[PDB]
Amino acid sequence: VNIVDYSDCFEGISGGAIFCNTKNKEYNIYNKELIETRRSPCSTFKIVSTLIGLEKGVINSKESVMGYDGTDYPNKNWNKNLSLEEAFKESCVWYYKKLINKVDAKSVQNILDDLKYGNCDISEWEGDLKNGKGHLNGFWLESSLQISPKEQVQTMAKIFEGDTNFKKEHINILRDIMAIDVNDANINVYGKTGTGFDEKNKRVDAWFVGMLEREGDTYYFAIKSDDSNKEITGPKVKEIAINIIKKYYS
Numbered sequence: 001v002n003i004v005d006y007s008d009c010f011e012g013i014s015g016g017a018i019f020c021n022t023k024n025k026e027y028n029i030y031n032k033e034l035i036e037t038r039r040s041p042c043s044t045f046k047i048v049s050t051l052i053g054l055e056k057g058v059i060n061s062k063e064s065v066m067g068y069d070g071t072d073y074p075n076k077n078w079n080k081n082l083s084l085e086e087a088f089k090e091s092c093v094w095y096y097k098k099l100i101n102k103v104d105a106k107s108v109q110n111i112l113d114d115l116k117y118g119n120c121d122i123s124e125w126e127g128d129l130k131n132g133k134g135h136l137n138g139f140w141l142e143s144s145l146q147i148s149p150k151e152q153v154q155t156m157a158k159i160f161e162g163d164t165n166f167k168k169e170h171i172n173i174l175r176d177i178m179a180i181d182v183n184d185a186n187i188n189v190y191g192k193t194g195t196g197f198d199e200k201n202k203r204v205d206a207w208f209v210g211m212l213e214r215e216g217d218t219y220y221f222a223i224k225s226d227d228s229n230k231e232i233t234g235p236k237v238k239e240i241a242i243n244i245i246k247k248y249y250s
Contacts, residue, residue, distance in 0.1 A: 006030040009243040015206075015225035017244060020153045021217055022161060027150070028248075033125045034226060038118050038146035042194035043091045043234070044209045045140035047174065050088060050097050051159070052098045052111055054170040059084050062173050088177045091193070101140065115155050115164065118147025131199075142199055142205065149222035152209045156220040160211055178210060182242050188213040189245060191221075193234030199202045201229050208238040212245055219249060 005015050016031030044167050045078070053059040061065070061084070068081040077090045087095035100108070104174040105122060112120040124144035127137030139145045147155075158164055160171060178190035191210020198205055206225040211218060225232045 001025050001029055003032065004028045004030050004248075006244050006248065009240055009247060010225075011240070013225050013229070013236070015223065015237065015240070016149060017118065017223045017241070018149050018153050019212075019221045019249065020157060021219050022157050024219065027153075029150075034224060035222075037150045037226075038148045038151070039205045039224070039226070040142045040196055040200060041118070041140055041145065041152070041200070042142065042196035042205055043059075043093075043131055043140075043145050043206045044152065044192050044194035045145070046088055046091065046096055047159075047178070047192050047209070048111075048117065048155070049096055049100050049140070050084065050114065050174055050177070051085075051166050051170055052059050052103055052108060054105065055111070055174060056103050058099050058102045062177055076082045084173070085177045085192075088192070094143075095134060097138055099212055112145075115158065116151065118145065118151050121145050142198060149207075150207075151222045152207075152222040153220045154220075156209065156211055160218075161219070165218060168229045180210075180238075182236065182245070184246065184250070186214070187245065187250065188189040189242070191238070191241070193238050195234040197230060198226075204230060204232045206234050206237045208234060208241040212242075214249060221245075 016034035018035045019028040064084045066080050073079055078092050091117050121144040122139045124139050127139055128145040180189050182189045189212050191208050194206040194207035203226045210220045211220045223237050225237050
């Protein structure tokens with residue numbers, strides 16, 4: 001473990017970051033207390049739920065559809081029979097709720113246990129119903145399931161280094177749909193945003209989790225904000241993550 005100071009890239013926002021290179025097995029850690037604290041993964045869970053759906057055959061490729069039924073939603077891009085790739089990039093909750101509700105709870109429990117996915121607590125399957133949002137809820141959305149940024153990186157490394165039983169074909173679909181454009185062709189960046197608000201503590205859960213490939217080296221990373229400013233979202237933390245990557249990992 002190497003303690004580092006990325007505060008310049010956070011532009012005043014409360015947060016932490018952890019980067020792990022598995023070739024030399026060292027973590028670079030900014031704000032160790034936060035990096036070790038379990039929080040709801042929010043939509044960063046879509047990394048794992050995609051793999052669960054592929055493993056169980058609910059979906060099969062980046063084209064796979066979930067049978068849109070015409071329900072009206074405010075985001076125009078949710079109002080269609082969108083593919084896995086666009087559901088992942090739009091963070092489309094109905095697609096992923098329908099996907100996971102096709103999988104039995106014991107299969108999910110055992111997969112999370114195998115991945116050491118934080119507290120592996122899916123006891124509140126329907127999620128945080130007190131927020132009034134009904135079926136737009138689940139155990140991974142400010143609910144029972146909690147994971148630390150460090151555990152996120154450890155899970156990411158296990159998956160994408162080939163250390164799980166997930167099919168390589170399925171890992172490669174995830175890599176495809178997680179790729180992001182960072183206006184720098186000499187690095188490959190992959191990840192997923194997550195946005196939630198922790199009502200009990202009045203702090204955001206804003207995430208960007210993924211990996212970086214740069215000339216032979218691979219780094220697994222998790223950037224997390226716990227700021228009390230409700231305007232801090234997953235996409236904002238993704239901007240911070242890209243600034244860290246360009247300043248310190250080029």
